[PDB]
Amino acid sequence: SELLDLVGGLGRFQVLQTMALMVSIMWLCTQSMLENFSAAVPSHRCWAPLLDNSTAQASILGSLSPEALLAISIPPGPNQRPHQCRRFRQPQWQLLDPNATATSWSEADTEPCVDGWVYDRSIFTSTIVAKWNLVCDSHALKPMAQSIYLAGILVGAAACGPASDRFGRRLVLTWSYLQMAVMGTAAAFAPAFPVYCLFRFLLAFAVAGVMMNTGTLLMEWTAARARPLVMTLNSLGFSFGHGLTAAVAYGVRDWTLLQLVVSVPFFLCFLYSWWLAESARWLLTTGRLDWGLQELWRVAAINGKGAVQDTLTPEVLLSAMREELSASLGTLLRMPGLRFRTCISTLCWFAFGFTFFGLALDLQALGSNIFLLQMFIGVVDIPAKMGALLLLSHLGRRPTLAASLLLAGLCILANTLVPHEMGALRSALAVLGLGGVGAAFTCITIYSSELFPTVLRMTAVGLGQMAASGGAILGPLVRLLGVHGPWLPLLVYGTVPVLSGLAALLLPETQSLPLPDTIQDVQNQAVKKA
Numbered sequence: 001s002e003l004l005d006l007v008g009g010l011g012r013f014q015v016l017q018t019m020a021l022m023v024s025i026m027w028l029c030t031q032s033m034l035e036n037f038s039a040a041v042p043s044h045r046c047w048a049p050l051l052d053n054s055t056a057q058a059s060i061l062g063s064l065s066p067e068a069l070l071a072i073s074i075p076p077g078p079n080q081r082p083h084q085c086r087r088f089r090q091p092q093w094q095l096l097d098p099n100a101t102a103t104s105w106s107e108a109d110t111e112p113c114v115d116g117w118v119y120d121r122s123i124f125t126s127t128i129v130a131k132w133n134l135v136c137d138s139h140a141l142k143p144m145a146q147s148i149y150l151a152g153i154l155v156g157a158a159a160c161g162p163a164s165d166r167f168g169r170r171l172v173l174t175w176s177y178l179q180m181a182v183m184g185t186a187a188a189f190a191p192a193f194p195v196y197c198l199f200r201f202l203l204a205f206a207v208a209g210v211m212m213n214t215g216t217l218l219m220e221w222t223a224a225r226a227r228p229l230v231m232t233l234n235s236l237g238f239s240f241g242h243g244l245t246a247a248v249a250y251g252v253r254d255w256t257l258l259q260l261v262v263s264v265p266f267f268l269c270f271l272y273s274w275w276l277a278e279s280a281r282w283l284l285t286t287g288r289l290d291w292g293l294q295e296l297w298r299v300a301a302i303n304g305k306g307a308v309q310d311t312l313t314p315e316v317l318l319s320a321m322r323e324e325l326s327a328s329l330g331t332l333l334r335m336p337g338l339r340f341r342t343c344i345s346t347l348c349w350f351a352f353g354f355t356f357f358g359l360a361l362d363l364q365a366l367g368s369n370i371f372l373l374q375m376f377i378g379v380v381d382i383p384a385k386m387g388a389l390l391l392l393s394h395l396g397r398r399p400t401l402a403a404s405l406l407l408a409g410l411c412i413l414a415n416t417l418v419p420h421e422m423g424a425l426r427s428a429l430a431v432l433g434l435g436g437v438g439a440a441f442t443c444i445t446i447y448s449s450e451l452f453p454t455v456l457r458m459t460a461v462g463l464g465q466m467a468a469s470g471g472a473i474l475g476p477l478v479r480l481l482g483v484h485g486p487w488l489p490l491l492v493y494g495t496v497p498v499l500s501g502l503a504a505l506l507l508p509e510t511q512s513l514p515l516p517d518t519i520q521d522v523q524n525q526a527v528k529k530a
């Protein structure tokens with residue numbers, strides 16, 4: 001802490017780091033809501049000879065309107081729209097006669113689209129669903145692709161955590177940037193759906209790596225007074241990423257060009273990312289004085305602190321480290337106070353992700369334009385984050401986290417009690433819910449990054465990220481369980497965050513302790529707590 005005070009805590013370096021990493025987080029959000037947009041399902045119909053063959057119109061003596069041909073070729077499906085997956089195969093000319101009931105056909109007259117589909121290009125010129133036939137039998141495979149992505153971020157977090165702790169944050173972040181950029185462009189140009197799925201998997205490895213290493217490096221270089229503000233800026237990075245996604249997708253509506261446009265900035269980001277400084281503190285806790293000295297001298301020179309360059313001799317630093325000198329997940333899970341801290345963090349992360357996907361359903365009731373909906377999500381997410389930052393600065397982290405989860409759960413229960421016809425009240429509760437989940441995200445990121453000591457912190461944050469992805473993955477099975485009664489999903493969506501807030505109330509008070517660097521340090525606050 002005194003070394004950081006010597007090097008300073010409100011200089012140009014932290015400002016540039018915050019801006020550059022917030023922009024990079026914005027682009028990771030663009031990748032995630034790229035996956036929210038690619039494979040949107042347009043209205044579809046069977047391919048029909050009489051419709052999509054100039055010779056078949058020239059063989060018809062006369063003229064029929066396109067609406068009449070559509071009625072004559074494809075039955076109306078659910079919601080008075082054309083049936084998406086069925087055709088009559090031959091034109092039912094009696095249906096033009098007004099003396100015909102709509103039931104003058106048999107189930108034997110319908111067959112699946114065996115010869116494929118004609119896709120509407122009015123909104124989107126091309127999507128993976130129209131190109132790769134992700135309709136009918138593969139409609140459920142779409143949630144499988146989302147499931148693969150979320151499993152990829154989970155396993156990536158579980159693997160990249162210990163790797164980041166072993167090799168350092170700057171190196172793993174840089175390698176994550178390279179892997180994400182290359183694999184994302186390869187995913188954009190993939191010939192087959194399994195190859196796309198593989199590239200999405202390897203991209204998800206790097207999204208998890210980037211998120212962890214940006215948060216980690218930010219905590220290690222920011223003075224304690226500025227840490228909430230800087231990560232709040234990062235969470236606004238998520239909201240601005242949503243808004244940027246909406247803007248780019250509105251401007252570029254072909255998925256290949258959109259994916260390429262979203263992947264190129266991470267190559268440019270990597271190019272400036274070689275300049276990024278590694279965490280001095282992490283280098284410091286592992287020893288290796290000469291390399292830590294070199295990094296401190298470089299950052300001091302970049303920060304304009306040459307008067308600190310002339311001071312700080314190795315004898316003084318060795319004297320200051322003599323007192324400080326005087327791993328596997330199983331180590332994290334075997335000592336009770338960090339087992340307990342990890343378990344509560346992991347449960348709260350699980351509750352976060354699960355509450356997120358569940359709450360997001362409501363957003364569909366407000367209207368239709370997906371671009372406008374994403375923009376409105378970002379715009380509403382921003383002031384909630386600002387309020388979260390002020391509450392985190394005044395009251396501290398634990399009461400704010402508990403209040404945010406309690407508000408979320410009470411909001412979900414109120415959504416359970418609101419009639420479906422009163423859609424405006426449902427919308428209002430949905431907006432309050434989304435604000436609460438965003439505030440909870442900022443709380444969980446601050447409290448999880450601050451709760452664990454540096455040597456095991458990355459392993460614990462990785463396991464937490466695994467828990468959030470576990471909630472997200474467990475989600476679709478609870479929506480498929482939703483068939484077993486309308487009250488079960490809402491009951492689960494209400495019970496999980498209330499229980500998580502109650503568990504979050506079972507945490508040790510923070511905001512006035514020095515950050516723990518070693519496991520031995522952790523015992524000293526516990527004795528003080530006892």
Ligand SMILES: O=c1[nH]c(=O)c2[nH]c(=O)[nH]c2[nH]1
Pocket residue numbers: 032353356357468469472
């Ligand atoms: O960066 C993310 N972390 C998550 O845990 C999560 N869950 C979800 O649905 N989307 C995202 N995005």
